[PDB]
A paper describes a structure:
Thus, a founding member of the vanilloid subfamily of TRP channels, TRPV1, represents one of the most sought-after pain therapy targets. It includes a transmembrane domain (TMD) with the central ion channel pore and an intracellular skirt that is mostly built of ankyrin repeat domains (ARDs) connected by the three-stranded β-sheets and C-terminal hooks. The TMD is composed of six transmembrane helices S1–S6 and a re-entrant pore loop (P-loop) between S5 and S6.
We purified full-length hTRPV1 in lipid nanodiscs using soybean mix and synthetic lipids (POPC:POPE:POPG, 3:1:1) and subjected these two protein samples to cryo-EM. At the same time, the model of hTRPV1 in synthetic lipids only included the residues 199–754. We used both structures for our analysis, but for illustrations related to the transmembrane region, we mostly used the structure obtained in synthetic lipids. The apo-state structure of hTRPV1 shows multiple well-resolved densities of annular lipids in the TMD. Most of these densities have a clear head-and-two-tails appearance and were modeled with phosphatidylcholine (PC). An exception is the vanilloid binding site where a bulky head density justified its best fit with phosphatidylinositol (PI), consistent with the previously solved apo-state structures of rat and squirrel TRPV115,17,19,32–34. Accordingly, the head of PI is accommodated by polar and charged residues of the linker domain (H411), the S2-S3 loop (D509 and S512), the S4-S5 linker (R557 and E570) and the TRP helix (Q701), while the PI tails face hydrophobic residues of S3 and S4 from one subunit, and S5 and S6 from the neighboring subunit. The pore of hTRPV1 in the apo and SB-366791-bound structures has two narrow constrictions, one in the selectivity filter formed by the backbone carbonyl oxygen of G644 and another one in the gate region of S6 bundle crossing formed by the side chains of I680.
Residue numbers in the entry:
A (entry chain A): 199 to 601, 627 to 712, 721 to 754
B (entry chain B): 550 to 601, 627 to 687
C (entry chain B): 199 to 412
The structure:
């Protein structure tokens, strides 16, 4: 629990820089391995993780005066990389500790700056940040995966104004003509990475992973995806939308002009049945595509059990459409007319799934997201209570009905008509007590139609006030996944020379030119 | 309808005519795209299921425009083969268009104002 | 791209008022014609437009101490009208540079005031603002067409309290009886103009033309 904890960790955590000097002189190392349960991540534990090592403790402790000592001393030669039981360095661990609190953000980014410079002052034989833990995650990708927008904003916009420590900048200003100043944001492992690009870790994040939808508003990401969109994804996406529209046009007439005379599999006799069979072939193949394209989404991401049903909603409804399609093949060869039952569900899913492709458009794509955030937030709450009432008063009505509205379906059906403006208050005279029948419908009308539908409109109006910004930020991620999937299924930015590493060479960098214009920054 | 031009000589009415513009384009265009996707989506799905004169894409698209104006019969055909399909598919239509998307329009149309 | 750019434009843009003094003494004119693609409007170009002329550069640069020098010197006699490849003067160009940012609004209107007075101190044989570019647009109509509400608010409400420079005011207070004070806003080329009244350029503006409705 307190395993590995030396007296030097006491000298640090108690904010006593004097004894940390003395304790290492006695032999007690500064590479001490606090592999204790208290000293690992919480995961249901009241503990604190800092990096398993003294240097990592002081960095995560509001202790800068100490951290410089753990390196600059003659007694011990504490390695600055110095991984732990999980591979995390001081820089990794210094991302594990961030909480997105503003007071924590200002602190971690200040400290995170200082160890980098110190890691360059002593020996440049590094690339600190290109080290990975035992999840194969750099601190950059670790702040993106763990949802640490504050650190991510720093690492991307990192500019250090001094000669030796500018190679570790990743925001280079190239030219300026007064108010105009032009940056050269580095793209190394934001879009092109071997392991865990920033974009492949924001967009493809698990649903919790906080601030999934804010991590892209971090400049240059909103601006780089819009470059990929305007350049080589707007053309492909609108071609994906074409083929899907044509596919739906083709699966629709092959469904509209289906046979009605016999059993399946029907047989080709006339010319017009050769045009539909292709319409049926070209229909099913897309259902193999959206099937395999859906299986891949559950084998090249392998999202958890929860992450089938909390954030993958579109990918489900194209896969689900494919299941109703590949149930429509099994039952068109099983000699069964229930393929139609599956086939109309495929159409209904299919056309509704145009509401996917309207994410290539801002005001329409935000609209498609509000629809999501109403189906789940306002319509689920509604349709639970509405079914309680509907089935509540239905039973109460069909109970009262005797001796064919003496049925629970038609009563639940006739009471669904009050809500669509088609309720007869006289759909039965087959009862024994009229005040009961009508007090019980007026109770239904008042509670469901007058109150609860109109209440839905109110809920549904309080939601729009809230998700106006969130749904734009959910829209840009949906377009991001569209950009990234297009890439995996064109290199952005040019290979500019920005400066020089502190060993003599040209620091070649793939960089994204941005052009801002201020009027108080005359320098 | 072009009287709604000349009501710009009046403040509270002329502002009203401008809100009408900024709803036709902002809220009703977004609505009537998605509404036609659903309408034509579920219509095809219904007239597919219909056999042997509601075996038509017009009248089905027409009868499904009646759920939104409060005139939708959930029994405008018995000419089908599967009733759960016909009614799950209309309730899907009603819930998505009438209960959700019209009432959502009112919400959008209220955030605009 | 950098065409026409002299070493004097360097001495200005680098905010060095000392070398601008020396460089004109060597013959390098202060009517220099920076007809370069970088020095024209963006229209899909990462450039900066200032007015194609040094006097126009410093006016659009957070440089007032320099602008008075480009006129008040014995070595060269920089014309204050001094049109460019598109006809814009310092006053026109000083509207092209406005962005409606509040920090830019306070700046351009302060500077836009100063060249007018200086344009009156040296020689009144002008009507600076009644000069037009090659679109037939004065700086007034150019701030209305280009959507520059901050400059437009200045030019219309322009009142300068001093004897010689009040003819360039266009907001004259006539009478006052304590709390009551009565203005006389000038209407010359707001409603009655030969070319491009302010109202005929706000209302009849293209749809982008920002702040049409403000
Ligand atoms: C026999 C089987 C019986 C059935 C049960 C089996 C399980 C059901 C399937 C599981 C799924 C259930 C879905 C329930 C309905 C709601 C769906 C909906 O709001 O999804 C919006 C979605 C948005 O994008 P995405 O999801 O990509 O974005 C996500 C998302 O934003 C996330 O928050 C962010 O992390 C991030 O942005 C990104 O990760 O976009 C679309 O889904 C495309 C548009 C599709 C239309 C959306 C409208 C709703 C249609 C529902 C009804 C279908 C049509 C009628 C069918 C009739 C009967 C057959
Ligand atoms: C997907 C979500 C639901 C959408 C649908 C929404 C609609 C409402 C929900 C409908 C769902 C339930 C449908 C009925 C289930 C089978 C029994 C049945 O049909 O009737 C039984 C009758 O007696 C009853 O129905 C009362 C017993 C309760 C059954 C339902 C469980 C309660 C939860 C669910 C209820 C919701 C409560 C609120 C929920 C929080 C048996 O009789 P019968 O089969 O009719 O046989 C003919 C009898 N005859 C010979 C006399 C003619
Ligand atoms: C102004 C905006 C629209 C307003 C109207 C809104 C209403 C909905 C929109 C209606 C617009 C389309 C109307 C149909 C076009 C002609 C084909 C036709 O009539 O039916 C064809 C059938 O098969 C089909 O209709 C399926 C093929 C798709 C056709 C439409 C293209 C998809 C986009 C548009 C669709 C929207 C999708 C969502 C949009 C994002 C051919 O058959 P028929 O001609 O009937 O011939 C009689 C056949 N009989 C002998 C068997 C009896
Ligand atoms: C094709 C979509 C293009 C999209 C753009 C246009 C926008 C869409 C807008 C408007 C729609 C306009 C067309 C409406 C149809 C009327 C004409 C017609 O087909 O009549 C025939 C019906 O046809 C069928 O039964 C064929 C059904 C499947 C067709 C799908 C294409 C086939 C695959 C290849 C496609 C090419 C792939 C390349 C695509 C680039 C008449 O025959 P029938 O006597 O009714 O007999 C039918 C069977 N029955 C016995 C059951 C009755
Ligand atoms: C080989 C037959 C040739 C003839 C076919 C005739 C065409 C008839 C149509 C459709 C019939 C074609 C077969 C079914 C396709 C299923 C739909 C599909 O895949 O959609 C995908 C297209 O992405 C593709 O890669 C599609 C395949 C390439 C297009 C080739 C045909 C287009 C020809 C015509 C070209 C235009 C010129 C015509 C006039 C305008 C959609 O993109 P996605 O990335 O999958 O995103 C959705 C999935 N997600 C939500 C889970 C992310
Ligand atoms: C077979 C034929 C299939 C149809 C052709 C399809 C292929 C060609 C498709 C698309 C090419 C481009 C279409 C025009 C877009 C205009 C832009 C616009 O107004 O955008 C605005 C609204 O969004 C819309 O207006 C889009 C409306 C829905 C999609 C286009 C209608 C046609 C498809 C319907 C019929 C489907 C059913 C089948 C029909 C038969 C949003 O603004 P923005 O523009 O995003 O502004 C930039 C903001 N941003 C940079 C932050 C993002
Ligand atoms: C037989 C017996 C049947 C019983 C009755 C059957 C009723 C069936 C229906 C609804 C059942 C009741 C569900 C109540 C949910 C409460 C709202 C909620 O949590 O909203 C959250 C949605 O995010 C989610 O993850 C919840 C999604 C709920 C189900 C989604 C499927 C709906 C598909 C379509 C089907 C709909 C039409 C149904 C057609 C019939 C958002 O909430 P929030 O404001 O953000 O706060 C929570 C924050 N949080 C997200 C971080 C947690
Ligand atoms: C919100 C808190 C939850 C409350 C839930 C409990 C509430 C329950 C309340 C009341 C319970 C009892 C009501 C029914 C009477 C008993 C049955 C009976 O014999 O009926 C008979 C007595 O004849 C009548 O006319 C009906 C009696 C008057 C009912 C109206 C007053 C109550 C309405 C206020 C309702 C509550 C308001 C609440 C406001 C907050 C019916 O006969 P008829 O119809 O005259 O003749 C048949 C006609 N025929 C021949 C044409 C066929
Ligand atoms: C959040 C809580 C939710 C609510 C929970 C609690 C429930 C709240 C809900 C409903 C409760 C309130 C309504 C009570 C209904 C009584 C029914 C009754 O008795 O019918 C009997 C009327 O009997 C008569 O004697 C009629 C003459 C009296 C006039 C009644 C007023 C009209 C009622 C209308 C109400 C509609 C408006 C409702 C607007 C509110 C039937 O007998 P009859 O033979 O038909 O009539 C006599 C002969 N005659 C026709 C010649 C006259
Ligand atoms: C053939 C006969 C044709 C009719 C005669 C037409 C000619 C005579 C027409 C108009 C003369 C004046 C009418 C009264 C105006 C009252 C002012 C008022 O209340 O204004 C308010 C509401 O706006 C309205 O009340 C206006 C309502 C619509 C127009 C007038 C109704 C008659 C035309 C309908 C029938 C058409 C169909 C044909 C009918 C046969 C607004 O406030 P304000 O007043 O603006 O306040 C000042 C604010 N401001 C300074 C910022 C702006
Ligand atoms: C939102 C995400 C998208 C989901 C889309 C996919 C959803 C698709 C769901 C389901 C797909 C399958 C449904 C139909 C059954 C197959 C066809 C068949 O044989 O039907 C028969 C089986 O008899 C029945 O009674 C129907 C079976 C029960 C259906 C109700 C449960 C599902 C409702 C929940 C719906 C989803 C809730 C979603 C909540 C989130 C019909 O026979 P009948 O009617 O009994 O007899 C005929 C009557 N007659 C003789 C008078 C003529
Ligand atoms: C965002 C996502 C959007 C949604 C997407 C997913 C879709 C969501 C939408 C709809 C899905 C939920 C509804 C399922 C409908 C089933 C239809 C069916 O099976 O019909 C069969 C009923 O078969 C029976 O067995 C009836 C007895 C069971 C009671 C059923 C409850 C009432 C359903 C009412 C529902 C209305 C209320 C709906 C309120 C929600 C028909 O057979 P029958 O011969 O007529 O009946 C048997 C004999 N009897 C009459 C003597 C009893």
């Amino acid at each position: 629990y307190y395993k590995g904890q030396t007296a030097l960790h006491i000298a640090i955590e108690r904010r006593n820089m004097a004894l940390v000097t003395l304790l290492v002189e006695n032999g007690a190392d500064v590479q001490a391995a606090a592999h204790g349960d208290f000293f690992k991540k919480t995961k249901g534990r009241p503990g604190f993780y800092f990096g398993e090592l003294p240097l990592s403790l002081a960095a995560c402790t509001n202790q800068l005066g100490i951290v410089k000592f753990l390196l600059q001393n003659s007694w011990q030669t504490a390695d600055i990389s110095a991984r732990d039981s999980v591979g995390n360095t001081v820089l990794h661990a210094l991302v594990e500790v961030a909480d997105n609190t503003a007071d924590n953000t200002k602190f971690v980014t200040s400290m995170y700056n200082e160890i980098l410079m110190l890691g360059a002052k002593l020996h440049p034989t590094l690339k600190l940040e290109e080290l990975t833990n035992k999840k194969g995650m750099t601190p950059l990708a670790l702040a993106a995966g763990t949802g640490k927008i504050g650190v991510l904003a720093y690492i991307l916009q990192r500019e250090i104004q001094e000669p030796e420590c500018r190679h570790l900048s990743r925001k280079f200003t190239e030219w300026a003509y007064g108010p105009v100043h032009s940056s050269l944001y580095d793209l190394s492992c934001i879009d092109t990475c071997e392991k865990n690009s920033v974009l492949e870790v924001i967009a493809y994040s698990s649903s919790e992973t906080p601030n999934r939808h804010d991590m892209l508003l971090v400049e240059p990401l909103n601006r780089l995806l819009q470059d990929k969109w305007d350049r080589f994804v707007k053309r492909i996406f609108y071609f994906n939308f074409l083929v899907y529209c044509l596919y739906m046009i083709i699966f629709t007439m092959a469904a509209y002009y289906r046979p009605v005379d016999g059993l399946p599999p029907f047989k080709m006799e006339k010319t017009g049945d050769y045009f539909r069979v292709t319409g049926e072939i070209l229909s099913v193949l897309g259902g193999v595509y959206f099937f395999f394209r859906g299986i891949q989404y559950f084998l090249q991401r392998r999202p958890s059990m929860k992450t089938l049903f909390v954030d993958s909603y579109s990918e489900m409804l194209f896969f689900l459409q494919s299941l109703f399609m590949l149930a429509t093949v099994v039952l068109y060869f099983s000699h069964l007319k229930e393929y139609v039952a599956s086939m109309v569900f495929s159409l209904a899913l299919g056309w509704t799934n145009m509401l996917y492709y309207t994410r290539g458009f801002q005001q329409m794509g935000i609209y498609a997201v509000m629809i999501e955030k109403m189906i789940l937030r306002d319509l689920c709450r509604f349709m639970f209570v509405y079914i309680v009432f509907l089935f509540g008063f239905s039973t109460a009505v069909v109970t009262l009905i005797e001796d064919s509205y003496n049925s629970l379906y038609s009563t639940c059906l006739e009471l669904f008509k009050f809500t669509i403006g088609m309720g007869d208050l006289e759909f039965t005279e087959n009862y024994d007590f009229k005040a009961v029948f009508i007090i019980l419908l007026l109770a239904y009308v008042i509670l469901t139609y007058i109150l609860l539908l109109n209440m839905l409109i109110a809920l549904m109006g309080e939601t729009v006030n809230k998700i106006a910004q969130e749904s734009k930020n959910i829209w840009k991620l949906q377009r991001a996944i569209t950009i990234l999937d297009t890439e995996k299924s064109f290199r952005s930015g040019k290979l500019l020379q920005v400066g020089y590493t502190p060993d003599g060479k040209d620091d070649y960098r793939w960089c994204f030119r941005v052009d801002e214009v201020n009027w108080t920054t005359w320098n």
